Structure 1
């Protein structure tokens, strides 16, 4: 909407809100990120202090698929199967059927342990497990299963 721009409220004002002393000239210190080490150094220090330099080792061809590992906390495990299934097997124990939460089927590979688990046995199947994730699962009466 060009009728709501500031250009429609500065018609009649000579300089269009750019000043009479310091005009609206072509450049205001260079083009792009020019002068990052000479006259815009105070801007780069203030707002991007680690812009200039090197840090870390180069990876000549990065295989970003190897670092792909979605994670789910223990507190979010039961939401994969829903609260209806969770309440159905609320009084399960050793010996009878216990729901299996296949994280890989839902796109989660590693199970991290954060937050609390409802006090029901559960079988958690995933590729990797955190240390506290296995402790919290076992303390609730469940089991940890490996995949792939």
Structure 2
């Protein structure tokens, strides 16, 4: 909407809101991130204090697929099957039939332990487990299964 810009409101003003003592000239200190260590050092120190330097080891060819590991906490496990199934198997214990949560089928590899689980037995099938994740699943009456 060019009719809502500031240019339409500054017609008749000589400098178009840019100053008379200091004009609107071509440059204001260099093109791009110029002068990162001479006259814009106070900008990089103030707002990007670790911009210049090196840190860590180079990975010549990083295989980004080997670091892929989606995570889900324990409190969010039941949302995979919904509250309808959760209430159905609310009154189960050892011996009878218990729902299985397939984290891998939903795209989750590692199960972390955060928050609180409902007080029902459940079987959790996944690729990795945290120490506190297995504790919270076992403390509620469930079992942990590995995959892949």
TM-score (norm 1): 1.00
Deviation per CA, 1:67-123, whole angstroms, max 9, x where unpaired? 000000000000000000000000000000000000000000000000000000000
Deviation per CA, 1:20-61, whole angstroms, max 9, x where unpaired? 000000000000000000000000000000000000000000
SS in 2 for 1:8: coil
Q: CA RMSD in A?
A: 0.2
Quick one: distance in 1 between partners of 2:138 and 2:75?
A: 14
1:102 aligned residue:
102
Query: 1:4: Cα distance to partner?
Result: 0.2
Quick one: distance in 2 between partners of 1:102 and 1:56?
A: 37
Quick one: distance in 2 between partners of 1:75 and 1:7?
A: 55
Q: Which runs of 4+ in 1 moved over 3 A?
A: none
Which structure 2 segments of 5+ residues have no match?
none
1:132 aligned residue:
132
Which structure 1 segments of 5+ residues have no match?
none
Deviation per CA, 1:2-33, whole angstroms, max 9, x where unpaired? 00000000000000000000000000000000
1:1-148 superposed matches below 5 A = 1-148=1-148
SS in 2 for 1:99: strand
Query: 1:143: Cα distance to partner?
Result: 0.2
